[PDB]
Amino acid sequence: CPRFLKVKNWETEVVLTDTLHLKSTLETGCTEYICMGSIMHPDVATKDQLFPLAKEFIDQYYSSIKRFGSKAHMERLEEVNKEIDTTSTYQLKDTELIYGAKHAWRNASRCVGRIQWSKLQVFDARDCTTAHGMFNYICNHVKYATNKGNLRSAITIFPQRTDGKHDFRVWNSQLIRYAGYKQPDGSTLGDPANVQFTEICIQQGWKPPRGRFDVLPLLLQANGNDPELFQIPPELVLEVPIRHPKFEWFKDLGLKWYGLPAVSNMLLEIGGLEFSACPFSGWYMGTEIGVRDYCDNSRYNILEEVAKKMNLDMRKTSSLWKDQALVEINIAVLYSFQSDKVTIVDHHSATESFIKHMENEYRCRGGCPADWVWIVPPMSGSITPVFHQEMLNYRLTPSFEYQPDPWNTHVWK
Amino acid sequence: RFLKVKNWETEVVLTDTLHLKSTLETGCTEYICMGSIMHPATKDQLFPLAKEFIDQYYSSIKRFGSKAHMERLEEVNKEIDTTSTYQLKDTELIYGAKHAWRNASRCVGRIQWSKLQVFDARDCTTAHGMFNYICNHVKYATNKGNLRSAITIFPQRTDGKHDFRVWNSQLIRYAGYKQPDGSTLGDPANVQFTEICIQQGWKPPRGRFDVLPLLLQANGNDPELFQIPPELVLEVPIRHPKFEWFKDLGLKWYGLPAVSNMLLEIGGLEFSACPFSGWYMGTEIGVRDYCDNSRYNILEEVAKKMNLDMRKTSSLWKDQALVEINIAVLYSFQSDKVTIVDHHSATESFIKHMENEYRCRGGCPADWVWIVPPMSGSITPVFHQEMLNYRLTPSFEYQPDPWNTHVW
Numbered sequence: 063c064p065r066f067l068k069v070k071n072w073e074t075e076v077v078l079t080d081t082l083h084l085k086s087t088l089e090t091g092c093t094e095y096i097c098m099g100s101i102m103h104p105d106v107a108t109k110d111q112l113f114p115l116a117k118e119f120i121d122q123y124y125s126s127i128k129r130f131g132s133k134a135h136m137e138r139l140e141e142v143n144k145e146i147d148t149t150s151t152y153q154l155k156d157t158e159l160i161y162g163a164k165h166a167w168r169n170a171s172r173c174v175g176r177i178q179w180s181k182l183q184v185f186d187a188r189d190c191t192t193a194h195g196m197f198n199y200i201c202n203h204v205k206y207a208t209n210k211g212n213l214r215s216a217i218t219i220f221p222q223r224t225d226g227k228h229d230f231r232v233w234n235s236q237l238i239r240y241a242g243y244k245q246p247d248g249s250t251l252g253d254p255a256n257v258q259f260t261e262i263c264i265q266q267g268w269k270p271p272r273g274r275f276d277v278l279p280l281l282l283q284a285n286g287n288d289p290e291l292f293q294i295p296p297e298l299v300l301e302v303p304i305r306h307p308k309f310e311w312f313k314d315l316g317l318k319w320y321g322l323p324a325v326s327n328m329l330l331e332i333g334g335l336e337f338s339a340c341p342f343s344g345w346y347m348g349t350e351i352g353v354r355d356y357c358d359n360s361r362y363n364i365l366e367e368v369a370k371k372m373n374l375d376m377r378k379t380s381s382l383w384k385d386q387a388l389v390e391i392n393i394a395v396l397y398s399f400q401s402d403k404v405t406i407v408d409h410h411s412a413t414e415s416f417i418k419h420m421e422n423e424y425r426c427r428g429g430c431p432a433d434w435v436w437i438v439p440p441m442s443g444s445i446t447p448v449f450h451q452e453m454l455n456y457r458l459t460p461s462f463e464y465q466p467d468p469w470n471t472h473v474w475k
Numbered sequence: 476r477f478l479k480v481k482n483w484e485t486e487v488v489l490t491d492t493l494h495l496k497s498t499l500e501t502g503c504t505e506y507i508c509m510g511s512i513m514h515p516a517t518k519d520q521l522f523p524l525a526k527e528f529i530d531q532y533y534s535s536i537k538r539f540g541s542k543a544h545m546e547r548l549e550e551v552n553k554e555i556d557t558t559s560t561y562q563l564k565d566t567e568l569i570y571g572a573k574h575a576w577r578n579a580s581r582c583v584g585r586i587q588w589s590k591l592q593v594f595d596a597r598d599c600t601t602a603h604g605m606f607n608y609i610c611n612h613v614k615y616a617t618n619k620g621n622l623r624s625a626i627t628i629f630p631q632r633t634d635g636k637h638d639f640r641v642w643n644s645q646l647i648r649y650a651g652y653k654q655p656d657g658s659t660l661g662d663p664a665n666v667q668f669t670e671i672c673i674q675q676g677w678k679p680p681r682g683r684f685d686v687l688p689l690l691l692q693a694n695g696n697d698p699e700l701f702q703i704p705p706e707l708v709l710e711v712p713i714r715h716p717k718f719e720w721f722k723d724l725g726l727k728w729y730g731l732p733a734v735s736n737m738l739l740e741i742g743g744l745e746f747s748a749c750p751f752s753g754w755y756m757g758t759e760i761g762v763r764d765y766c767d768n769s770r771y772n773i774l775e776e777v778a779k780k781m782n783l784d785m786r787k788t789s790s791l792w793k794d795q796a797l798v799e800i801n802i803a804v805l806y807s808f809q810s811d812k813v814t815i816v817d818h819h820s821a822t823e824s825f826i827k828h829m830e831n832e833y834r835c836r837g838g839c840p841a842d843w844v845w846i847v848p849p850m851s852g853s854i855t856p857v858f859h860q861e862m863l864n865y866r867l868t869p870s871f872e873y874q875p876d877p878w879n880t881h882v883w
């Protein structure tokens with residue numbers, strides 16, 4: 063691979079030079095003859111696999127605290143190696159855990175919000191042993207992160223994988239989501255994105271209220287055991303009713319959303335260790351609610367209704383009635399969150415911050431991996447500064463990774 | 476190996492076998508993806524490329540290994556021997572030009588690919604001849620508003636010292652004027668080329684919609700200026716179906732998008748002048764040509780006349796104004812019966828085109844970064860469509876601007 067790679071911004075003419083890509087450790091899925099950059103997704107480590115991965119991480123950590131080659135560095139290497147030698151694994155120090163979690167976010171090429179990466183509150187839950195204990199840790203995370211609407215980014219890290227038969231998992235895809243119910247006539251009540259998980263909860267014993275906005279229970283698996291249901295205390299679930307600064311009729315749609323986006327189905331990888339339960343949360347970009355959650359066809363799909371109540375012609379697509387209604391919904395989402403003092407960021411501000419962040423990372427770190435397909439917002443792409451920004455995508459570790467859905471792999475006791 | 480691509484909205488899965496036929500590199504590696512980078516002969520090299528292209532041509536008309544195929548191969552072999560190049564048959568020129576479009580991974584309009592009018596201009600020798608061929612192209616393609624896809628192909632490169640080049644980036648573009656007081660009159664995308672035309676003798680009217688002259692280079696000679704006869708330049712006054720004040724902004728645009736600065740490559744031969752034209756997708760005017768920072772940038776004025784709060788970005792005033800500008804463009808073209816497609820219809824057709832290509836061809840190279848429109852991305856069907864990008868030949872390629880190479 064070439065040692066310097068240049069990326070250009072076609073609006074400002076700024077050219078940046080990337081050297082960090084040389085530290086890339088994982089495959090992208092592309093080859094020299096095919097690019098898979100729009101593909102959504104393109105047994106444990108042996109002793110011998112784990113040694114180099116741990117040394118790589120430990121070296122990186124000691125370089126970061128400006129103690130590379132030191133006595134403490136060499137001692138840590140020796141102590142990790144003895145642990146892997148005698149137990150086939152090792153334990154991270156608290157300092158290393160915190161560093162590893164912050165850098166998995168810093169390295170998340172699909173995240174536009176990384177300007178905040180170093181202000182992450184890390185909760186160490188590696189002493190957890192039961193689903194009830196997982197529920198306690200998750201409730202504390204939700205309350206801290208919500209902070210009465212002044213949201214704070216946070217991650218809670220449960221015990222790492224051992225033999226793969228004792229995994230901790232949150233079966234929910236996010237800690238707070240709304241249920242969806244397939245009706246016998248084919249329609250859906252609630253959130254169509256969550257029909258399958260809702261059905262799993264109902265089999266596991268949940269009594270569904272069967273409304274549009276029913277917070278799903280937590281489904282928590284500790285130490286490889288069968289998962290258990292818990293209702294999040296509703297006073298911990300901050301919600302915002304959606305209204306519009308101009309259209310008085312918008313509140314009559316009866317929409318609301320929850321304040322806290324907390325993804326709970328990803329895997330955190332640090333120094334070859336695998337943390338299969340690591341829920342993390344930030345705050346929303348408005349389009350994540352207003353474009354995707356409401357207007358996606360396999361979601362709430364109320365573009366039609368808003369268009370109708372706006373009395374747009376819906377016969378010609380070239381009237382752009384869909385585009386007009388989409389902007390209005392996203393105006394309402396941003397207005398409702400700001401009015402209730404719940405942290406939210408519009409797509410103009412977020413993308414402007416990410417450009418400043420990318421520039422700083424190129425300056426101080428030698429690069430910033432970024433996935434243009436995900437960084438550019440799902441509406442008004444070209445009037446945001448990331449549209450004209452060239453980006454290089456590559457995979458650094460520590461990292462957040464995808465993992466299979468637990469119901470496809472769980473061995474029922 | 477076979478590769479699958481999934482639409483996450485319809486859950487339709489397609490299987491790509493066509494990518495196995497590519498031999499040009501994309502710029503990515505196993506460790507770094509350059510999918511958002513804009514730009515990532517000899518007789519010895521020339522025969523295999525010719526052989527590959529002849530083979531796929533005779534495989535396309537289903538006469539692979541025929542008497543005609545065998546003789547054409549030997550014919551091409553002898554011609555590269557004794558002249559270090561070769562000439563395409565007319566049928567091959569048409570085939571290659573249609574397939575360069577079919578293979579253009581960044582083009583959302585490819586459902587039309589086999590309806591392309593191919594003008595053979597390989598007998599041209601002078602810039603005056605180029606002007607005549609280009610006028611004929613513009614008149615044919617414009618067709619009084621019922622636009623028709625066309626390409627005009629000038630002589631291929633020989634030694635690199637005698638290139639034919641159209642210096643304009645499009646056959647029809649408006650001038651841009653760098654003002655003393657900082658800003659820009661006309662089109663800011665074209666400020667540099669406008670100055671190259673003035674430096675060549677062009678008397679600029681210094682208006683806002685000054686059609687640039689053609690600057691035409693034949694056989695490596697210095698380029699010469701020509702004014703396209705104005706009755707050939709179809710234009711559309713931009714007005715808005717509900718905002719009666721919109722017409723008072725004074726805006727218009729031209730009907731015919733004709734890209735003239737790219738290179739067409741067929742069987743190892745390079746055609747450095749090959750203007751090709753279609754019709755517009757509305758966002759190419761209403762989003763990029765009018766609202767980019769380095770373009771007309773009227774966004775601010777439209778939102779003014781709509782009386783939107785512009786103090787905070789979270790009012791999405793930019794987004795509201797962008798939708799209304801694009802409504803006006805589509806309304807204006809359609810009212811004047813000038814061909815134009817909206818980004819919803821165009822992406823719908825592209826998904827249909829992908830389905831056709833996977834069925835009859837085993838795939839369709841597609842560049843999601845370019846296929847997804849510059850506004851309202853996720854409420855169009857291409858947003859949720861996985862795409863594989865790979866390079867097939869014949870193709871359209873980028874080339875350096877001629878003013879950075881040409882020896883005067």
Ligand code: HEM
Binds near residue numbers: 175
């Ligand atoms: C602090 C405010 C944050 C904002 C505004 C934000 C914004 C976003 C957005 C808009 C996306 C893409 C969502 C979509 O595709 O619709 C994303 C993805 C992502 N975010 Fe952030 N994010 C934030 C915080 C965080 C934190 C705290 C973490 C981890 C500690 C994180 C890790 C990720 C990851 C891993 C992805 C990629 C998901 C995937 O690959 O499937 N983000 N973020």
Ligand code: HEM
Binds near residue numbers: 585816821
């Ligand atoms: C017939 C109607 C057509 C439509 C609606 C259309 C639409 C588009 C659009 C919207 C783009 C992206 C432009 C941008 O946003 O910057 C594009 C790119 C492109 N189009 Fe088409 N197009 C059409 C016809 C054609 C024809 C006739 C040809 C060639 C014979 C062609 C070749 C290309 C190529 C090569 C590109 C990519 C340019 C690059 O790689 O830089 N298109 N098209």
Ligand SMILES: Cc1cc(N)nc2cc(-c3ccc(OCc4cccnc4)c(CN)c3)ccc12
Binds near residue numbers: 347
């Ligand atoms: C902390 C945080 C804040 C925020 N403001 N936003 C966030 C969005 C994601 C995110 C977005 C889309 C995702 O989706 C991938 C996908 C979707 C459907 C099918 N396959 C794959 C996932 C993966 N859980 C996470 C993750 C974290 C976020």
Ligand SMILES: Cc1cc(N)nc2cc(-c3ccc(OCc4cccnc4)c(CN)c3)ccc12
Binds near residue numbers: 644737754755
């Ligand atoms: C036939 C046709 C119809 C249409 N309706 N639309 C079209 C748009 C393009 C096109 C768009 C963007 C481009 O830009 C790439 C670029 C710009 C500046 C510097 N490097 C690279 C180019 C290449 N000139 C062509 C080409 C052809 C088009």
Ligand SMILES: Cc1cc(N)nc2cc(-c3ccc(OCc4cccnc4)c(CN)c3)ccc12
Binds near residue numbers: 449763767846
């Ligand atoms: C990442 C990306 C995706 C996409 N889908 N499209 C993109 C279009 C441009 C772009 C490049 C050059 C442009 O202008 C020509 C130019 C010439 C010389 C110097 N700078 C600029 C314009 C203005 N239309 C847009 C840049 C990046 C793009």
Ligand SMILES: C[C@H](O)[C@H](O)[C@H]1CNc2nc(N)[nH]c(=O)c2N1
Binds near residue numbers: 436437438
């Ligand atoms: C097929 C396509 O890759 C897929 O729909 C992606 C595209 N880009 C995206 N970008 C973001 N931020 N979020 C998404 O869910 C997606 N979906």
Ligand SMILES: [Zn+2]
Binds near residue numbers: 092099508510
């Ligand atoms: Zn790639």
